[PDB]
Amino acid sequence: EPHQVYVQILQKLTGQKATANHAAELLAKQFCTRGSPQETTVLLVDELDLLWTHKQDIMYNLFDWPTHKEARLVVLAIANTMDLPERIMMNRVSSRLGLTRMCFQPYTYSQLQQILRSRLKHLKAFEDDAIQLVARKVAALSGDARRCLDICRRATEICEFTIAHSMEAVDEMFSSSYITAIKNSSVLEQSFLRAILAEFRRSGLEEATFQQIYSQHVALCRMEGLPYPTMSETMAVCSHLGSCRLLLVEPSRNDLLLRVRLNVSQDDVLYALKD
Amino acid sequence: HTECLSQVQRILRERFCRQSPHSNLFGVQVQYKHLSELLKRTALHGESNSVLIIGPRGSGKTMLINHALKELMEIEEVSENVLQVHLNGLLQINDKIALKEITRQLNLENVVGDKVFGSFAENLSFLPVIFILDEFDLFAHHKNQTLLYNLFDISQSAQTPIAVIGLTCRLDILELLEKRVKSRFSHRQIHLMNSFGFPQYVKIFKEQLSLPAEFPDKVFAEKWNENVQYLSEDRSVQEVLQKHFNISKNLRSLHMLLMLALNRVTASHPFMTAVDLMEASQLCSMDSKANIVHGLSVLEICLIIAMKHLNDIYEEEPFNFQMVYNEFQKFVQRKAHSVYNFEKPVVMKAFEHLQQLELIKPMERTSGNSQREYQLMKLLLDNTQIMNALQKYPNCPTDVRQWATS
Amino acid sequence: VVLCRESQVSILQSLFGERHHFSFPSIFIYGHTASGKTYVTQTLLKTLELPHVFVNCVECFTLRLLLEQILNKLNHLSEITCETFNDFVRLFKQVTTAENLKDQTVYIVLDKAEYLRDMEANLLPGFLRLQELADRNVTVLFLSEIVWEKFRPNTGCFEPFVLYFPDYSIGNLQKILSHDHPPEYSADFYAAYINILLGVFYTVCRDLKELRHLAVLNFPKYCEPVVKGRDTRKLWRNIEPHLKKAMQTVYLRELPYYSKFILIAAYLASYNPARTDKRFFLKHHFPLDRLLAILYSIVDSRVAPTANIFSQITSLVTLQLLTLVGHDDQLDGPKYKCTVSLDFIRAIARTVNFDIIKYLYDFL
Amino acid sequence: SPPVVVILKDMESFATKVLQDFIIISSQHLHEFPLILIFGIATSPIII
Ligand SMILES: Nc1ncnc2c1ncn2[C@@H]1O[C@H](COP(=O)(O)OP(=O)(O)OP(O)(O)=S)[C@@H](O)[C@H]1O
Ligand SMILES: Nc1ncnc2c1ncn2[C@@H]1O[C@H](COP(=O)(O)OP(=O)(O)OP(O)(O)=S)[C@@H](O)[C@H]1O
Ligand SMILES: [Mg+2]
Ligand SMILES: [Mg+2]
């Protein structure tokens, strides 16, 4: 709970157990009254944006208490959004955190290469080309060291089984599996997808009822020579397709009047179905 | 004789209904090898990993994990150090319940405490244990995903080794996670697809209905193997299998069909027949709507025909009771002296009964302001379905049939 | 006893097998209203002498009541109170370890399951896969009139075995109705009664319960003529008009003065478009003010706006003859609708000597 | 063994759903305890 942070800080400094409101009151009394001279308090709060409240009392107290001379409190707030003190924080506290905003830019590919070299000092295990390509992909995608380490570990694992290892890692841990899932789909599911595409081309809309899709599927099956499908079979296939989040449907109560929306781009479907 | 039939019935019922573990694995050699290798790495060392397994429901997601655990737990005394926790998204719907289950499974309630106190630092401060998360997608729908974030954090920490395993049917599980947990999630994914052809499905069917080598009677087992092998190439059995394979490749439906086929095995017919498989397939592939229509009465049939006429004249528009009554009156008035002299209340009760069977659904539901009359109703059937059902109606009169044709 | 029900009984007996054997995790039974699902299933369970718990979904309108009733009845077969599904599963595992519950299949009979989809989202998936979670040889049965197509959750779950109970026929109904003949007369007498009754009412009423109720009600008048003194023609001629009178009700089994004027004015306001109001009332060529103007126009005598007419309006609202549409706090622009049938307003108009048809725009 | 008598004064204002629920629940427990209903209707009996 958000209000429980008052209990956590109090228990960390004195070990006392109290209610959220009483812990807040005791912390207020300690930080507003001239008590015994205590050591300077270094407070670190992680994931600030998740402490938000409609009343903004906790945030106001957190960023207002060090303003008091008697507090002897230094607070560092780590967050991901730089807009927070502007559009999330009100004016008086925004001016309190104003002009003290540190922004950490993402590592350049040179920085990533330096980090990787420091990780692998005195160890000749990777070729420079794989390292440079991995750092460059990381720079061009997110510039994150965590996924870089994951890619390096996967490359080591594949080498246990060169640039090929890094390419396999990057195109296996980043690329989407929709195309291969469509490729491994059944024949009836492919016919259903073709019927949906044909109906969409005829109409031009991105939403279609189940009845027209069923009619198009029946026409396609007649063209293909497939046996006549029942309504229950088509509904079961559609329900299975919606289960893996390839479509969008609410078939709990509506059966013949179900709106269907594609979860993937039309061109990807065409490129998967041409083969 | 009877004892052998009872034993084989018990064994096959245990195989299908309870889904008992079996050494046979189909098209999952690489995936199982990878999963077992990573489990051994996580067990023999202090390293931590996180893996998600994606596949359609009924594709043996749990079987891979169970077989790997049975293979690797009994390797050495590591299982004594290894602890396992199983969590299902259906039973545990709240974080408090999940925490309570975690505490009770670890037998730490004495250490942590018995009361309902919300503090969890007793475990957190103290925190090799493996975690199994059934229906992992449901946990992502919690208010703050606190449990998942804490599990990922402790997996990424250097305090204790923790293995996290999740099961998901959705293919978009990556976008259901928040940015922080997605960044902290080790991108290890295994995909379970039925990547095999129809002949491989035939082989699977042949092997599944094969008696094990541990059966007491050996000559009877060999004769059963001969029977199933002979039934394998029969073109009617192949046609039924082809139909069911076109419908769906999931093994759960195949297990259900095999179970229903075995139900018709008696003393007089110890060995199956292709006609038994045909009967089972026919019973498994019937539409419910036509069955519901078949059990109606004459007045309901006339009302449905009037409804179809309304849908034809007014293309894809709602209706109420008054218009249907008026046109039924028109039909009974054109005929000279047909025996259909019925009053309003009985027709109203018939309409209420039809609405009760949920063949007709209201639009933009409201009550009090609008009565049952003058209420926008729609039909949930197709014209071809009505024609096919009326064709098989036992005693449909000529007059109503010709009205339907009109 | 069950008549003309032998295929489903044999199928269920084969499915059950032996007591120590396992069975399906979920079986879904569907049928018509008078199919006899409860009768057949409960008679079969009683005959086989199996451990079964009979539960009504309507009575257990809350999850706690459902789980506590199930557990208490199971314990009685072998106080316990539970609140959550996981606690219910744990206690069920604890309670099923009885010697009488060791090597036997546990059956949980649920009827009127149409309400289960409106109780909780995850309750049905939990019930469907109970045998996997408990692993204690447990089977759950379903009785409903709605097909399985509407019971499927969005995420998909373990598919139950679907079963259908066959619909009845003329011979089947005649056998069932003629089985319980009165001992005071010949079987052929009651058979002829059932024959004529079926020949009259099978066209509309196929409900076994309702037709049997009609036979029970009408039998004494069937047997009066013979008491008064095997004459088929005599019986049919004496009894025919009573049958026609009975068929008039198959399924069926004085306002104050100013109230009538209020009612007819409300009907006119509801069923007449506003554009034609002056065309019907202005001497030369819905909100409350329109009603007041129409009422003032209709009544030949000058009526004072006494509070009693407002009390009449409110009472008519209470009697569900006039429905309030607008907000309750808005009692300065209220909206009303009339829910009176046309035959009723014509009948009440006749007692007043007023011709409402001459003013109805739709008829003109 | 005396029965139990329940009086419903103004059923026009009663919601239907509670009425059907009470009727269906009480039907299955008539053997447990007798129950008799008395209806007071201001309008014509057709309203039932
Ligand atoms: N590769 C496989 N090897 C052996 N059996 C398999 C395999 N794939 C599927 N099966 C069988 O498929 C049947 C249905 O799978 P289930 O175990 O019911 O699905 P699941 O693993 O429980 O996944 P969910 O999402 O939890 S329902 C079981 O009897 C499995 O034995
Ligand atoms: N096959 C049958 N053989 C003998 N009597 C039957 C048969 N089917 C129905 N009955 C009788 O008809 C009565 C009414 O049937 P029900 O059991 O109420 O129907 P139902 O299928 O259970 O539908 P619900 O669930 O009650 S709405 C039963 O109480 C029996 O007395
Ligand atoms: Mg499973
Ligand atoms: Mg019943």
Spatial CB neighbours of B367, under 8 Å, sequence gap ≥ 6: none
Residue with the nearest Cα to atom 3 of ligand 2?
C2
- One-letter amino acid at A72 equals R
Contacts of C325 (CB under 8 A, 6+ apart): B369, C334, C335, C336, C337
Experimental method: cryo-EM
Cβ A239–C156 below 8 Å, yes or no? yes
Question: CA–CA separation, A190 vs A183, rounded Å?
Answer: 9
| Closest CA relative to residue C88, chosen from C134, C29, C153 | C134
**Residues C348 and B380 sit within 8 Å (Cβ to Cβ):** no
Helix (H) or strand (E) holding A76: strand A73-77
Specify whether the CB–CB gap between A207 and A261 falls below 8 A: yes
Locate the chain C residue with the closest alpha carbon to B20: C132
Which element (helix H / strand E) includes C285? none
Residue B219: phi and psi, rounded to 5, are -65, -40
How would you classify the pairing of strands B50-54 and B162-168?
Answer: parallel
Cross-chain residue pair A240–C152, CB shorter than 8 Å = no
Contacts of A11 (CB under 8 A, 6+ apart): A17
> How far, CA to CA in Å, does C157 sit from each of B137, C55, C128, C129, C296?
14, 23, 8, 8, 66
Phi, psi of C321 (to 5 degrees): -90, -30
Give the long-range contacts of residues A53-61, CB within 8 A, separation 24 or more: A53/A2, A56/A89, A56/A90, A58/A2, A58/A3, A58/A5, A59/A89, A59/A93, A60/A90, A60/A93, A61/A24, A61/A28
Tokens read off for C96:
């099923």
Distance from CA of C66 to the nearest CA of A (A): 24
Cα-based angle C299, C305, C310 (whole degrees, multiple of 5) = 100
DSSP annotation of A246: S
Q: A258 to chain B: which residues are within 8 Å by CB?
A: none
Which residues on chain A are in Cβ contact (under 8 Å) with C116?
none
Apex C210 CA angle, C31 and B355, nearest 5? 50
Q: Which long-range contacts does C194-199 make (Cβ < 8 Å, 24+ apart)? A: C196/C236, C198/C170, C198/C173, C198/C174
Q: State how far the Cα of B76 lies from the Cα of B362, in Å rounded to an integer.
A: 64
How far is residue B261 CA from its own chain's centroid?
20
Residue B39 burial (CB < 10 Å; 0-12/13-18/19+)?
buried
Measured in whole angstroms, how far is the alpha carbon of residue C256 from the centre of its chain? 36
Beta bridge partners of D8: D39
SS3 C243: helix
Q: Which H or E run contains B20?
A: none
- Count Cα atoms within 13 angstroms, Cβ side, for A106: 14
Residue of chain C minimizing CA distance to A248: C154
Q: What is the stated resolution of the deposited model, in angstroms?
A: 4.1
Angstrom distance (rounded) from CA B335 to CA B400: 11
Specify whether the CB–CB gap between A10 and A26 falls below 8 A.
Answer: yes
When scoring C111, C255, C319, C321 by the number of chain D Cβ atoms within 10 A, the one with the most, hence best to mutate, is: C319
> Angle at which helices B344-356 and B298-313 pack, to 10 degrees?
80
Query: CB neighbours of B279 closer than 8 A, spacing ≥ 6?
Result: B264
A47 is in an annotated binding site: yes
Residue B143: Cβ within 10 Å count: 7
Atom of ligand 2 nearest to the CA of C34: 19
At B156, which amino acid appears? Q
What sign does the CA torsion over A199, A202, A204, A208 have?
Answer: negative
d(CA C42, CA B90): 31
Helix, strand or coil for residue C107?
strand
SS3 C139: strand
CATH code assigned to C6-164: 3.40.50.300
What is the distance between the alpha carbons of residues B177 and B189, in angstroms, rounded to a whole number?
15
Please state, in angstroms and rounded to a whole number, the distance separating the CA atoms of residues A200 and A194.
Answer: 10
Rounded Cα–Cα distance for residues B243 and B251 (Å): 14
* Whole-number Å distance between alpha carbons of A115 and B255: 54
| Residues of B engaging A, defined by a Cβ cutoff of 8 Å | 56-57, 118, 144, 169-172, 179-180, 183-184, 186-187, 189, 191, 193-195, 243, 246-249, 285, 287-289, 361, 380-382, 385
The verdict on the CB of residue B166 being under 6 Å from ligand 1 is no
